[PDB]
Amino acid sequence: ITGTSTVGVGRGVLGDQKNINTTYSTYYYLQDNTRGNGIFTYDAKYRTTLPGSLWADADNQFFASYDAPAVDAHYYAGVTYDYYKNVHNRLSYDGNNAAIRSSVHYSQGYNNAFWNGSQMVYGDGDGQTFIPLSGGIDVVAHELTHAVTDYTAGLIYQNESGAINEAISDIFGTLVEFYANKNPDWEIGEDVYTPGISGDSLRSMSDPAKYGDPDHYSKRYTGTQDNGGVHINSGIINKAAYLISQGGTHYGVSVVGIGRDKLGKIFYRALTQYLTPTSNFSQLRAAAVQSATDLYGSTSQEVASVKQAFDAVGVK
Numbered sequence: 001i002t003g004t005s006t007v008g009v010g011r012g013v014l015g016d017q018k019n020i021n022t023t024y025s026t027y028y029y030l031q032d033n034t035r036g037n038g039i040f041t042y043d044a045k046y047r048t049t050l051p052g053s054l055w056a057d058a059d060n061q062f063f064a065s066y067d068a069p070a071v072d073a074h075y076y077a078g079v080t081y082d083y084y085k086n087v088h089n090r091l092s093y094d095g096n097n098a099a100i101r102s103s104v105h106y107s108q109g110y111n112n113a114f115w116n117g118s119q120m121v122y123g124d125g126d127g128q129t130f131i132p133l134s135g136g137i138d139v140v141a142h143e144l145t146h147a148v149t150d151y152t153a154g155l156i157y158q159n160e161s162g163a164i165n166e167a168i169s170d171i172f173g174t175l176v177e178f179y180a181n182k183n184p185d186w187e188i189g190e191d192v193y194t195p196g197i198s199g200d201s202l203r204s205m206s207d208p209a210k211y212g213d214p215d216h217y218s219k220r221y222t223g224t225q226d227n228g229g230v231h232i233n234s235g236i237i238n239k240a241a242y243l244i245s246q247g248g249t250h251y252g253v254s255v256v257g258i259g260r261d262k263l264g265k266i267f268y269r270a271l272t273q274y275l276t277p278t279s280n281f282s283q284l285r286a287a288a289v290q291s292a293t294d295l296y297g298s299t300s301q302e303v304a305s306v307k308q309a310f311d312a313v314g315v316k
């Protein structure tokens with residue numbers, strides 16, 4: 001909508017207060033004009049018609065329980081935009097400041113979030129498996145990274161290319177979480193997963209096997225569930241990325257960590273320069289090696305650590 005840019009305040013899913021960029025035109029809309037061509041947050045009103053209604057508020061104060069998922073989807077979309085612009089010089093998910101749109105209150109008791117090819121969508125959870133999923137910055141960044149992937153490598157969402165697609169979203173979801181620097185970890189979804197169970201998460205990058213996901217290529221799932229296990233075999237790549245950044249000895253193979261920033265530069269370059277829709281795990285290794293070579297040289301520790309990490313998870 002056309003209006004004047006202003007700043008509101010509210011509370012997110014976890015009860016934390018934050019300011020949000022809004023637009024005033026009779027009502028205050030969750031429309032942030034300070035980033036690219038706008039960040040727009042919508043209310044699906046417990047239905048599945050998308051995008052729903054652009055979120056309208058009468059007084060620019062968003063402290064109602066019903067407001068919280070919108071606050072966080074809107075705010076964390078902005079953080080993720082900032083990450084890609086400030087860290088990778090990428091303007092929104094298409095590189096040309098495409099508008100970022102998010103809908104919350106999707107359906108009833110919906111225990112998931114997703115990028116639908118045009119926008120992000122967040123369920124409220126059922127209060128047992130999940131609370132509203134936009135409360136997790138790694139979830140928000142995970143989904144928006146799917147958009148980045150769709151506009152760059154275009155990894156098909158099945159089998160190994162789909163598992164890479166998932167891992168990329170977990171990797172940059174985590175790197176955005178570290179970028180914002182509020183309780184950062186190498187776990188996925190911990191902030192919105194199982195409110196009645198402490199210390200758990202949906203996936204682990206540091207130890208995928210914690211939740212039954214493979215941490216080595218020999219353990220990859222080869223059935224048909226989950227589009228060929230795209231959320232399962234992602235653990236193999238998540239572990240490799242974790243090792244590149246943090247180091248460790250995995251199945252007896254030692255990896256010297258090079259830190260989160262260099263992990264991001266290597267995998268972002270791989271994603272945007274070398275990966276293709278049909279890339280498999282072995283092609284990802286080559287892409288990451290070439291990216292590290294571009295950035296730091298063929299004889300660098302960085303290239304060495306990329307090789308060790310993929311060796312450690314059995315990807316040749």
Ligand SMILES: O[C@@H]1[C@@H](O)[C@H](O)OC[C@H]1O
Nearest residue numbers: 065066067069124125132
């Ligand atoms: O879980 C939902 C909650 O996030 C919202 O605030 O009010 C409706 C609930 O279904």
Ligand SMILES: O[C@@H]1[C@@H](O)[C@H](O)OC[C@H]1O
Nearest residue numbers: 045056057064065066067
């Ligand atoms: O209570 C909710 C209210 O906060 C919102 O503004 O409109 C929908 C209602 O369910």
Ligand SMILES: O[C@@H]1[C@@H](O)[C@H](O)OC[C@H]1O
Nearest residue numbers: 045046107108109110124
């Ligand atoms: O607020 C209620 C919400 O919790 C549920 O998801 O659908 C019915 C609504 O009235």
Ligand SMILES: O[C@@H]1[C@@H](O)[C@H](O)OC[C@H]1O
Nearest residue numbers: 208209210211212213214
């Ligand atoms: O999937 C397994 C899980 O069920 C168990 O609790 O801990 C080990 C995991 O491999």
Ligand SMILES: [Ca+2]
Nearest residue numbers: 057059061062
């Ligand atoms: Ca209000």
Ligand SMILES: [Ca+2]
Nearest residue numbers: 183184185190
């Ligand atoms: Ca965390």
Ligand SMILES: [Ca+2]
Nearest residue numbers: 138187188189
């Ligand atoms: Ca996390």
Ligand SMILES: [Ca+2]
Nearest residue numbers: 193194195197
């Ligand atoms: Ca939990």
Ligand SMILES: [Zn+2]
Nearest residue numbers: 142146166169
């Ligand atoms: Zn995903």
